[PDB]
């Protein structure tokens, strides 16, 4: 016999292609200032062509969308800090005073006053460091801080991901799918679901909803972080009960925090019963990989972005304990979390570079979904799972665990019993 060519038969080969963002019309229209760049709107025509007798070896810890889509955030966020004004000359020998007009806070705020080219300002204990009543910012000299423009905000905006022609996205739809290995239902879609650039540590705020699943590059390994997606959301409401006063100083214009209207610390709240129920569902799912002894201890230590629970709330960035949610021990058979506020923050663990959060006026309140947890197995009594997080990559992997980019080669050959002339 001989060989024959068939231009068009389905063929796959794993490869990496540069995808492009995808957005919505009304969503794009609602873009005051730059709460987050014009993006292509996608026609709501989800092909979702469910394939039959199909099986492609998905993967999540070697996926290339995560490294891709994380890079998109970095470049976009760098542009969010470009047009704004540097605060290079802003820092000078301060005259802060431990003024406590009201106590909830416990003297967290400071009545800072600088001899600018003589105005007072408020700064929490985090954003200022004592020097030797003289103080200075944590890192202005031998460092670089750029304040965000006051007009812009930082509320997440949903983003879809679509591949160019010649590359198709395979989406796994199996209900039970730990992340690796073959997936039975492989639905081919061009534009994925509403990925959310949620910026948060171990507590995944308001992401996609899952049974609770346990996903890990290697459980036997203590190094890799364990992602747990919740089947049922847990409401979290967290408020800043202080009306902030924004004073503009013509230096360019710095935005100092003026005296607060009437002082209660920012605080988060969690329904203790619902949290207790979900955690049992977690510990019951963990025991599948393991009866045994399970203990939860709070974050062991490290930077303030990991020791606590960092998240964004209406253009303000909160650091709060999680000792009130990870203190338990489980065998086979509302909660309020204290917080802190920081305005000079260096997200993504970058040295030198950092952004100054402009003040936001009034009492700040926000509500979100606790849908995912990041746990770190400790180094055979019990396996204490402390909350880790840290690397910003993981919070993407809780959404992109069910997508891959494949190159299609419609060309193909076959040894058919046929001959040319």
């Amino acid at each position, epitope marked *: 016999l001989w060989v024959t060519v068939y231009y068009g038969v389905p063929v796959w080969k794993d490869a990496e292609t540069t995808l492009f963002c995808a957005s919505d019309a009304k969503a794009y229209e609602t873009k005051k200032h730059n709460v987050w760049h014009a993006c292509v709107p996608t026609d709501p025509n989800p092909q979702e062509i469910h394939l039959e007798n199909v099986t492609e070896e998905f993967n999540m810890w070697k996926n290339n969308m995560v490294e891709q889509m994380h890079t998109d955030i970095i470049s976009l966020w760098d542009q969010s800090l470009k047009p704004c004004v540097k605060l290079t000359p802003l820092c000078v020998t301060l005259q802060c005073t431990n003024v406590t007009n009201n106590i909830t806070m416990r003297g967290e705020l400071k009545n800072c006053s600088f001899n600018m080219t003589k105005v007072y300002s408020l700064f929490y204990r985090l954003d200022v460091v004592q020097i030797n009543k003289e103080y200075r910012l944590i890192n202005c000299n031998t460092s670089a801080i750029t304040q965000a423009c006051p007009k812009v905000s930082f509320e997440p905006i949903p983003i879809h991901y679509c591949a160019p022609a010649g590359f198709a996205i395979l989406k796994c739809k199996d209900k039970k799918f730990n992340g690796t290995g073959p997936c039975p239902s492989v639905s081919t879609v061009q534009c994925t679901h509403g990925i959310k650039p949620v910026v948060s540590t171990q507590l995944l705020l308001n992401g996609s909803l899952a049974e609770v699943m346990i996903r890990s590059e290697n459980i036997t390994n203590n190094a890799k972080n364990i992602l747990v997606q919740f089947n049922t959301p847990v409401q979290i409401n967290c408020t800043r009960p202080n009306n902030n006063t924004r004073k503009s100083i013509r230096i360019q214009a710095f935005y100092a925090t003026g005296d607060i209207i009437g002082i209660r610390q920012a605080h988060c709240n969690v329904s203790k019963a619902t949290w207790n129920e979900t955690l049992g569902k977690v510990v019951k799912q963990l025991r599948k990989h393991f009866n045994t002894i399970i203990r939860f201890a709070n974050s*062991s230590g490290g*930077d303030l972005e990991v020791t606590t629970h960092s998240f964004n709330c209406g253009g303000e960035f909160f650091y709060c304990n999680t000792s009130g949610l990870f203190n338990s021990t489980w065998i086979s058979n509302s909660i309020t979390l204290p917080c802190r506020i920081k305005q000079i923050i260096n997200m*993504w663990q970058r040295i030198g*570079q950092a952004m100054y959060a402009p003040p936001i006026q009034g009492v700040i309140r926000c509500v979100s979904n606790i849908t995912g947890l990041i746990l770190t197995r*400790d180094g055979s009594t019990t396996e204490t799972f402390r909350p880790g997080g840290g690397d910003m990559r993981d919070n993407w992997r809780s959404e992109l665990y069910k997508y891959k980019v494949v190159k299609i080669e419609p060309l193909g050959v076959a040894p058919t019993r046929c001959k040319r002339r």
Partner: T-cell receptor
Amino acid sequence: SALTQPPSVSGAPGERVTISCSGSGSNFEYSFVYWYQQVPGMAPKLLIYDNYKRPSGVSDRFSGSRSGTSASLTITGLQTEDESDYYCQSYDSSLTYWVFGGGTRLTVLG
Amino acid sequence: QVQLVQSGAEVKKPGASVKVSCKASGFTFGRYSFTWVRQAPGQGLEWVGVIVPLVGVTNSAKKFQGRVTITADTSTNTVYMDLSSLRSEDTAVYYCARVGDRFGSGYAMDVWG
């Protein structure tokens, strides 16, 4: 902002050893801890970072963890190629200046 | 293949100044950083300084305050360290170590000259 280490700890081949790293200052509780393996004549090589993450291509017998205000590096199955100096580093993010521990010496019996 | 090539060993009279150079090996500065660590012979190493060529920010240890000058050039992918007023206390081997990864998101010292 100062880190303390044991001077020297030796281990028999094939056994498990641990090394402490204790540093004063509440900032020690607000800063990471790394560990560096350093051949007595060569350049340092990264051993573990972010207190539990192994860099790609490092032996799985190395693993450490934090404990309150101290750090610890644990090696399982010590061989005769693991004798060197081990340095624990605490990167103070606020003050923006790394600090290196004194250096702990490990020797394999033989 | 990623390496931090260096200049050769140096011998200097006390009271002088020393210049040491480090050059990339197939990459630009990008968003990475660079740092310098010295190790006295028969002694645990110690920190010296750090620079970020992307924004031109610097810092150094308190012990070497006013004695170290950290420079960078984006044209030729080189970072030079200028330490002033050498004495017997500075008889040490000086490594230049890379910091971070493709996003500058790290803090460790992984690639060493």
